[PDB]
Amino acid sequence: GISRDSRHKRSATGAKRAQFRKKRKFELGRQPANTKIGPKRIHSVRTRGGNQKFRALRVETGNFSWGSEGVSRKTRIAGVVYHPSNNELVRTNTLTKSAVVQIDATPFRQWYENHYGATLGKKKGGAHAAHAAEVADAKRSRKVERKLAARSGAAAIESAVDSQFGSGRLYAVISSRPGQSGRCDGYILEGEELAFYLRRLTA
Amino acid sequence: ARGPKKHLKRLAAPSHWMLDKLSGTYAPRPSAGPHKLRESLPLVVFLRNRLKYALNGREVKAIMMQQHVQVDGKVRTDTTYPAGFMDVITLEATNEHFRLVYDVKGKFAVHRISAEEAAYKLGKVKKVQLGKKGVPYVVTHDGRTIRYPDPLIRANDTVKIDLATGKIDDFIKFDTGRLVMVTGGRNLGRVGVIVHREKHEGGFDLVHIKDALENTFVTRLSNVFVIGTEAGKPWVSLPKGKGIKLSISEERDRRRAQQG
Amino acid sequence: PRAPRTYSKTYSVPKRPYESARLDAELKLAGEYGLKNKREIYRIGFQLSKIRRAARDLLTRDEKDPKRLFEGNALIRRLVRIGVLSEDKMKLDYVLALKPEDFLERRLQTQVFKLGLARSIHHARVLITQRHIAVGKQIVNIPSFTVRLDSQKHIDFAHNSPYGGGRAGRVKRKNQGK
RNA sequence: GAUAAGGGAAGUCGGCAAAAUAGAUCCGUAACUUCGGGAUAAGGAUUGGCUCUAAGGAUCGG
RNA sequence: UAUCUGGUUGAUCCUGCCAGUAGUCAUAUGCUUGUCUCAAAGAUUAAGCCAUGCAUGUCUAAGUAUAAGCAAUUUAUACAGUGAAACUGCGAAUGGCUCAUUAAAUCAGUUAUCGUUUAUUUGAUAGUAUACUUGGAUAACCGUGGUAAUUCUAGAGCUAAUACAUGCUUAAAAUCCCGACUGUUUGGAAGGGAUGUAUUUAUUAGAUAAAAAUUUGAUGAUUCAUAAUAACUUUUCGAAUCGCAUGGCCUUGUGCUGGCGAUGGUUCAUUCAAAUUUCUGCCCUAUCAACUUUCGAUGGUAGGAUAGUGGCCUACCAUGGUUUCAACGGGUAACGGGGAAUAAGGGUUCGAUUCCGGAGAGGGAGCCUGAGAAACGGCUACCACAUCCAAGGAAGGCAGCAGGCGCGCAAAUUACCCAAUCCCGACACGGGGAGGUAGUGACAAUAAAUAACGAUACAGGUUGUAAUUGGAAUGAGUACAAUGUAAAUACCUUAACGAGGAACAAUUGGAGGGCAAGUCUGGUGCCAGCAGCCGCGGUAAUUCCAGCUCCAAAAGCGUAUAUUAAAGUUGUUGCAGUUAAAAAGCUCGUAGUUGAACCUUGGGCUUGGCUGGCCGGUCCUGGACCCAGCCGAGCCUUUCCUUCUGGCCAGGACUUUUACUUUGAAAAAAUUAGAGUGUUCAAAGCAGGCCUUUGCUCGAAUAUAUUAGCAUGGAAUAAUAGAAUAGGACGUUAUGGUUCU
RNA sequence: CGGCACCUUACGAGAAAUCAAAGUCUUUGGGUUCUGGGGGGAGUAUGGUCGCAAGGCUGAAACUUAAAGGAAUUGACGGAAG
RNA sequence: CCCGUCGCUACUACCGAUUGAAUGGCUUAGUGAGGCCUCCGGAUUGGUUUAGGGAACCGAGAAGCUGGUCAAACUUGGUCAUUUAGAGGAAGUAAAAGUCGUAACAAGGUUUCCGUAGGUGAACCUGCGGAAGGAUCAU
RNA sequence: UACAACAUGUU
Ligand SMILES: CN[C@@H]1[C@@H](O)[C@@H](O[C@@H]2[C@@H](O)[C@H](O[C@H]3O[C@H]([C@@H](C)O)[C@@H](O)[C@H](O)[C@H]3N)[C@@H](N)C[C@H]2N)OC[C@]1(C)O
Ligand SMILES: CN[C@@H]1[C@@H](O)[C@@H](O[C@@H]2[C@@H](O)[C@H](O[C@H]3O[C@H]([C@@H](C)O)[C@@H](O)[C@H](O)[C@H]3N)[C@@H](N)C[C@H]2N)OC[C@]1(C)O
């Protein structure tokens, strides 16, 4: 099958090598997973040493990290917007490592609203401002008011991340290897990395 | 080729086993265990070729199936168990105890020891690091791991292991002036004292040693084994010869002194 | 398979097959010592050549060289214990003067006809072959058996031979019937 | 003026007549040679529709 | 043993080859063949083809027994012993065979994994936030059967688990999050969630420049070990298992407790291993000079894939990579090495093959299972071979052992056995053409018979020499016997036999020279034949064919081919080139090789070790000092030696690169050399030897390895760089300006 | 000082003829390029390459054979001299 | 002493129409078995369990199907290496006494030889320019 | 002026 040997290559001088043995099992390769966004479908592969890999064929959700806040939530992948290796992966919505995705911002919104007692998005929408104003003042005890007050100051986030929350979709990058671990995890894009990928996306 | 080897050709056997050339095609392949295949001494060899108790391998299996043989205080039923350096061999039915210690000749000599000394063993510390739950441990040269060792125990130190409990009694620091024994190379088996340790980062550490007769000989740090605190005071019983090298003329003279 | 067992050749034929002088010398040696063929002279020539080579190689070295002090004295010990050298020539210089007759004189056959056990050296070899000779209490039937200096005084007949305290051979036991 | 199973020049003085090939892009191309050629040698692959993307410019303004 | 002899001429001195001579773990062949020991053996050509039989199986008290199996009536009406079948587990990836492919590949010596997987062994290692113990299949078994045929199997009926699939039995507190209420200047709380280990991701620990305006592991080195926070997961596993004994506590309940083991299972370590990997090192060829990059070639970024690194693959990008210091291509009647023969030295040649590494199982390719295979005494397909058939179909892989055909100059029995060596299994028990034993066996090697001694007549010049006169000696052979062995056979011991032509009869090549040994006899007559070479043979042949005699080696001798020495006829050591073979017609010229001289030399003092001598001290031993000599060490001479801090080791900051030479670590056995040792000697083997048994005892040395690599002193020899448009060196305690840590 | 040469001797060389280099080479080593390895087949065949051609350069093997050859000596011979 | 052509015989190799033949390797293109991954599919089957009779509802899962991937094998064309048949032609070598002449060795009776160009049964002759290895070291 | 050649093999 697929082989990872280097003996089938030409020499560094350009010489053609002669075959030295038949293909070995300890030098095999396998087909790519080509993970798509869809209802979960994970297959198991028995590997060298009797070990076991998981090939993500389709995945709906992933574990995503907010690095500057130190909290990670299980949210929903909305799609792929950018892939450095190949734009065809974007076009077909193929999840690999380093792909830039949009995830649902809902769980992170709940965490931030519960934690700092504020709102994200800056969208004074018709029904949006109703929610924003209600979140501003809720039914809430006094020691919790004080803990939130102490938590303010470290409550504003950077503008570029904040402006995204009005859509419910945050930009993110996959960090796991879905074809290997069977999971599609990542972190929220922030800082100059976010600025770089926004510059690429606007083209 | 497709998997592990299970036979051992007789000419491929280690040269310290003193195997004859013509007894057969094969030699006992030592099992996996606490010592390296090349630096071990399988029990069948020890009880057949050395002690001469058994006449053949089938008698070695007849002996060992009846719980007679013990290594480090534990009964072994493996005819090819990889007994190695410092290992204590005990024969209860004959009430007889042995320790595998190199002689100056480079062989595992047959060394009878007392029952009181047949209750511990020395061990060279190979590494120390923390395990699961933050617990530190050291590894000896026989694949023994001991949890919660003394905070001062480092690599190349020697610990005194209590065989009944597997716990560390006391340890010897590696430094200048220590009584050591060479466990590899040309100077296998010779006992000396540390004179100067020479360091080479990324490469190999050399250790200058000196015998009781003042001859200095250098050896790789990997082949050193700390066996005593100072000159003349080891923590184990020495083979008949005290680990001292004689020239060929000297051994000829001593042979003709005790046989003529 | 089992390890191979060593084997070597113990002689070498001459480079020139037809030098008449040395042919006469070999014939004289065989006739004097009652040998069977020329190969028996070739074997002692082989042994003598290698001994002289060893002595020469050691004598390239200083009197203080340890390798000389060990191997040369071992060689001297072996030569003086087999009867080739006496108790006054232990210096490796007299090792170079040894001749084939020195080894021929120390054979079983030569010493058997020298002691008096047989009349002719041929009769000595003939007695040795028929197991009438015992060194110590061990019967030796090898005429090239080299006797050592501490073995010369124990050569005599075998207890079971008709020459040293035995019964009669088949010839006499058939000829005593009448 | 067309088509024809299986065969494929057995027809005939003779492949006469007919069939087969054919545009363009890419690949590949022998003997021989007056070195100019032979050469489209021989011989292979590709080609629609639709929806896109990229490259190749002109004139103004420091 | 650092060696030569014959052949060109009428004769000579050369060049030069032919021939002679010796060796071959070197093949074949011819003749001959008594004994003991040892021992190669279908590699060469055909990795050609194979009838037949065998070569891989395996159960302990401790996984599953209602055999309609045998035995017990005994500790037992749930089983209990022995024991087929079958389910489960493990092994079948070791071994053995062969050398086809293979030329930076294999391999060798050295490296690396801070780049990974690892059954098993050996150590450690888990109290985690219906339970006096859950299910329902299925095999074996009974019965109905189909096909010509296979180790084919189908309906149907039962029934087990350490098979399959589920599932609780648990400590003590403490920590983090949300937080109804409440006290109210920042506090108490009810009520909820999360705590082990695996998986995945993100983020935090994982420390250390000395005077005025707080503690932490390893490494040469890390994002290492480890710990923490937030979550994640088609939720990994933290024992629904087995055998022996069964004791202890009384609050006597069919209560609570608990000894030795079997088998398990997470992680780490360890061991047995794998996979990649650094440096350097291969035969012939230019009638191969450019190669690689279309379709990965060299590199970069991201991903995929893998056990893991890596163009290993994909996308995008750059235009790179090798080469006269020989790339690339071609040939190999090429698997590599340890090694072998020859051998003054230097060399030349061989190494399929007892050990190590690689590769393959007719040829390709693709896979299942499994820790481990791209396995072939496993599967799938195609090609080629080849088998059975009832014509529908089915079954294959001897480069395993033996055997056959073929091929050829060229190579053995379709034997016995697990007793030894050792391997495998659930295993003290079973299995093993692995292995051992015998058969064949002039491969090679060791020892070693085929005769010995008397007297008469002779003879000699005191026995060296003669025919015919006797008595012994014995092993070849045969065979009681024991021994040897798993059983044998053979050896060894041995009763009875076992020699005059001791017919129990030695051969193979020669007799002109090289080269040892006839001009003896008969035959033939340049014929027949011999003859390595020079030559012989034409009617007196020392050369042919024979007889006699003689020579050489002998249980062996000859022949053919390859190869080594001789060959200083491949020449670096070390050839030859005016005329014997051979200076390019002549100049230029790149690579290569090679290149003038010069830079710390002399002097003085002190002082360590060795050799011979005045002291002699002679028991080969050594003594103040002296005559000399050699090899070391320290200071001073303008004085080179890194610089600063502790104060002849232990710290920071520095360092022009090499060749060369010295010294060390390390470097499988076998083989080589070599020490010991009465295998009866020897080849060999690694044994063995003693006070005489309840034992004792020396041993299984020692050198050689080293091109390359890693450490390490020297500083001649030969290179390499420096300060010249000064952009040059030192200012340590010279001053200032900025800026960083 | 550079040249073209020559004469004598034999230091030393050589198989000798002869050589001031053909010497300083078994007492074997200043640097470097090319060529030869018994006689023939053969500078042939073949491939390549240059030339208009004639030809040049590069360049084997099978097979065959015991000498071919160099320098000198004595003799014999010469349509060689005295 | 000796040269070549010619005559008989034998052996070796070469050229050569035959778009000659065979063997081994590599390979473009076309076809393409079979695994593996993937996609559906759903013989059958147990109940995620619930149905008054079972009615909504879950888990396992064979053939087969889609798209890839490794890729045997065959057909055609190319290419490299080795071997090989052949009418005829042209050489070489070997083999007691066959033929023709006499080219060389003496000034070999025309001194010999080198290169080149013609000619001729053959050795060879002739032109041009060289050499002495000459038959002259010299007027 | 003209002058060509002398069978094979030895002792
Ligand atoms: C070896 N023994 C010698 C042997 O040499 C014999 O040889 C001559 C030989 O010289 C003669 O002479 C021959 O020598 C050479 C060369 C071969 O030597 C030949 O080429 C040539 O024909 C002839 N000159 C020749 N006719 C044969 C024997 N008669 O001369 C006599 C002899 C005693 O028989
Ligand atoms: C010296 N030149 C000669 C020329 O003279 C000729 O010579 C022949 C020679 O070949 C003949 O000889 C030849 O032929 C005979 C026989 C077959 O006839 C053979 O036995 C002999 O071995 C062979 N050499 C010989 N018998 C006469 C000479 N003139 O042969 C040609 C030639 C070679 O050019």
From TrEMBL, chain A:
Keywords on record: Metal-binding, Ribonucleoprotein, Ribosomal protein
Domain of life: Eukaryota
GO cellular component, one term: ribonucleoprotein complex
InterPro entries from the UniProt entry: Ribosomal_eS8, Ribosomal_eS8_CS, Ribosomal_protein_eS8_euk, Ribosomal_Se8/biogenesis_NSA2
Amino-acid positions noted as binding Mg(2+) 2 in the UniProt annotation, renumbered to this chain: V90
Statement: the UniProt record of this protein carries the keyword Ribosomal protein: yes
Record-linked PANTHER family: 40S RIBOSOMAL PROTEIN S8
Family that this chain belongs to: Belongs to the eukaryotic ribosomal protein eS8 family.
UniProt protein name: 40S ribosomal protein S8
Species in which this protein is naturally found: Candida albicans
UniProtKB/TrEMBL annotation, chain C:
Cellular component, GO annotation: cytosolic small ribosomal subunit
InterPro entries for this protein: Ribosomal_uS4 (IPR022801), Ribosomal_uS4_CS (IPR018079), Ribosomal_uS4_euk/arc (IPR005710), Ribosomal_uS4_N (IPR001912), S4_RNA-bd (IPR002942), S4_RNA-bd_sf (IPR036986)
Region Disordered: start-end pairs: 159-178
Domain of life, source organism: Eukaryota
Record has Nucleotide-binding as a keyword: no
GO terms assigned for molecular function: metal ion binding; rRNA binding; structural constituent of ribosome
Residue ranges constituting the Small ribosomal subunit protein uS4 N-terminal domain according to the UniProt record: 5-105
SMART domains, per database record: Ribosomal_S4, S4
A Pfam family matched in the record: Ribosomal_S4
An annotated GO BP: ribosomal small subunit biogenesis
Keyword Oxidoreductase part of the UniProt annotation: no
Domain RNA-binding S4: 106-170
Binding site for Mg(2+): K36
Keywords: Metal-binding, Ribonucleoprotein, Ribosomal protein, RNA-binding, rRNA-binding
Family: Belongs to the universal ribosomal protein uS4 family.
PANTHER family per the UniProt record, alphabetical: 30S 40S RIBOSOMAL PROTEIN, 40S RIBOSOMAL PROTEIN S9
Protein's name according to its UniProt entry: Ribosomal protein S4
UniProt organism field: Candida albicans
